[PDB]
Each structure stands twice: as structure tokens, then as C-alpha cells.
Design a protein around this nucleic acid. Structure first.
Lengths: 126, 53, 136
RNA sequence: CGAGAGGUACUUUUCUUUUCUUUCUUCUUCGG
């Protein structure tokens, strides 16, 4: 069901603070895939420092038994959004209701994602 | 001294802070901002109970 | 390991150098900061987003780098990020023994065929800074 | 019915990125 699974580690925060009361655009370079990532994470609710590692899954469903619209509850940062731009060294553009994502990596790792589809975002800090 | 009302006190037998009369805070964020200005953002966390009035 | 001048990536633009100096001397040891310089676009009223700090030894510089890599330098809700600078703020060797203070300097040339020395002038109470990295 | 007075009534009505430069002292190029 899951079409993307990798182990990310962050390198930069865009506000780079503690109590800015805003969203933080993280910069996470991944191991063994050379993939760059932009993601707006709510630091005040879900804390993320600079140096820690976290896994990331991207599945179009959650119940893992078909039924395209019992669930995956092994993560802690489950989100949902749509992919609206696959304009490519390919790069994705996913918006989770206002929070933008930019999954830029090799063109062979990201090839099963279609246009204007609904996909989730699963994350866990090990 | 950064609190408006008498919420936090000082323990003379321990030389540390305590909480006496906790229902006198009036939800004016004066000690959380002082702790964030002192470089301790996770020092004092005050949340309201949704089931106790 | 050549220089001790450290450039901070993101300092607040509403501060003065004394507020950063007291913060660095509160987290690290007392009076362990030698030089501190915040560059300004204007003359004296518009500081920039970065600053250069020069420490007194290499151990406190490595300790500040270890504190910055572990995200333990929070100065007014700003996480300080240390990097490497281009040159020292003051060309001073980081060694307590290389800075020879209050010594006698004399000039001249060997006069006779032996290894003698005739002095024209004499300078008392001069400094001596042996810059190994700058090779002078 | 005309004159004299005081009063309500135009309020910001167009400032632009808020990121713009100081890490400086550095090989002229060709042929006899």
C-alpha cells in the first residue's frame, strides 16, 4: 500500500527558534537516497530539533486492506493532502490543506505518483 | 515578582518555588512570557481543565 | 583549528553586543570572549543578521561549537548556529606563551669578524606576537 | 415670507519588497 518509505534526518529550520508561534519549514536530507525535502511542521505541537532522525511513509490509504475511500496507527504525525504539481531530478509539490511539501529526489524513486490524487503523510520520530 | 496575583511562592525550607492557591491565576500570561524571556521556554506550562469549573 | 573567530548565523537584530556578550559569558565561562563585532549596514543604527565572535582559547571554541550543534544556545527564542569565519577580528596568536610582554628589543649588525653585535638604538617594553597561521 | 448667526457633514484615501554594497592588500596580455 505504501509507495514511499525512507529514513530522513533534518539539517535546517527556516525560523530556527523555539517560541515563534508560526510554522517551520524544515530541510531534511535523507540517507541512501540523496533526497531533499521541504515540509512545514508545527513545532509548538510536534517538536523537532536539528539533528534527530525520523521515518516517513506516504500511503494513499490508511486501512491497509484496499477500500480506496484496522488503520495505520504506528505513526504520530499522520497528515493528508493532494499532489498538484509534478513539474520536474524530479520534485513533488504536495499541499496538506495549506502546508506545502517539496519532495525532490531522483526520477526513479518517485514515479508511481499520479496528478491531482489524494495521498497521506505518515511520520514517526523513531 | 512577574506574576500579577499571588500564584507562586518560595519555600523557606527548600529554597525553591512552590504553588500555593492555584485558583488565583486569572489566565494572564505574565510568568510564561517572563520564562521565555529568561531563556527557559519549557519551565512553566499552565493549561485550563475543560471539565473543572 | 587555525583560527578562533566564530561567526554566528542568526542573531536577533534588536540586541546590542553587551546582551550577546553576557549571554555567551553566562553559558560559557567568565570573560572567555575576546572580541565581538556586529557588522552594520548604516553607521551606528542598523545591525545585520550575523555577528563574529572571537574566543580566548580553542577549548571554549570547541565547547561553544558542541553546544551549538546540540541546539543548546537559545538567545531570545533564537537558536544560534556557529560556523567558520574568514579571518580573525584582531591578528593575535591564540597562545598564552607566544605573546611576549614587556621585553627588550634591540637592533644592529655584527661589527667585527666574530659573532659580536653593535646596537644603534634600544627599545624597552615592546610586544611580540608570533603568528604561526599567518606566517609572520 | 426674506436676511443675520451657529451646527451635522471629505476618514488615512496612497508609504513601499521589511531581505539593496565592505570577507579586506593583491599576478595586464603578446614578440625579441
Amino acid at each position: 500500500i505504501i509507495m514511499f518509505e525512507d529514513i530522513f534526518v533534518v539539517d535546517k529550520l527556516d525560523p530556527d527558534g523555539k517560541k515563534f508561534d508560526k510554522v517551520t519549514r524544515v530541510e531534511a536530507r535523507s540517507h541512501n537516497l540523496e533526497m531533499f525535502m521541504h515540509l512545514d511542521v508545527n513545532t509548538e505541537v510536534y517538536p523537532l530539533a536539528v539533528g534527530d532522525k525520523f521515518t516517513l511513509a506516504m500511503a494513499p490509504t490508511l486501512n491497509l486492506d484496499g477500500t480506496p475511500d484496522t488503520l495505520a496507527d504506528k505513526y504520530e504525525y499522520i497528515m493528508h493532502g493532494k499532489l498538484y504539481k509534478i513539474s520536474e531530478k524530479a520534485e513533488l509539490y504536495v499541499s496538506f490543506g495549506g502546508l506545502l511539501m517539496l519532495l525532490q529526489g531522483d526520477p526513479a524513486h518517485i514515479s508511481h505518483f499520479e496528478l491531482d490524487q489524494r495521498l497521506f503523510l505518515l511520520m514517526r520520530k523513531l | 515578582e512577574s506574576s500579577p496575583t499571588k500564584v507562586f511562592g518560595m519555600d523557606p525550607v527548600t529554597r525553591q518555588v512552590v504553588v500555593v492557591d492555584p485558583e488565583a491565576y486569572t489566565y494572564d500570561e505574565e510568568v510564561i512570557k517572563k520564562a521565555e524571556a529568561m531563556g527557559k521556554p519549557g519551565l512553566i506550562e499552565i493549561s485550563p481543565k475543560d471539565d473543572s469549573f | 583549528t587555525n583560527r578562533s573567530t566564530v561567526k554566528i548565523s542568526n542573531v536577533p537584530q534588536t540586541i546590542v553586543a553587551d546582551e550577546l556578550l553576557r549571554f555567551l559569558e553566562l553559558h560559557l565561562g567568565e570573560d572567555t570572549v575576546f572580541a565581538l563585532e556586529i557588522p552594520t549596514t548604516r553607521d551606528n543604527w542598523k545591525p545585520r543578521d550575523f555577528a563574529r565572535v572571537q574566543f580566548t582559547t580553542l577549548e571554549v571554541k570547541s565547547r561553544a561549537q558542541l553546544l551549538s550543534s546540540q541546539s543548546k544556545l537559545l538567545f531570545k527564542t533564537h537558536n544560534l548556529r556557529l560556523s567558520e569565519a574568514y579571518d580573525d577580528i584582531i591578528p593575535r596568536p591564540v597562545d598564552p606563551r607566544k605573546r611576549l610582554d614587556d621585553i627588550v628589543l634591540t637592533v644592529g649588525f655584527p661589527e667585527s669578524d666574530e659573532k659580536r653585535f653593535c646596537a644603534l638604538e634600544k627599545w624597552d617594553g615592546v610586544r611580540c606576537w608570533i603568528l604561526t597561521e599567518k606566517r609572520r
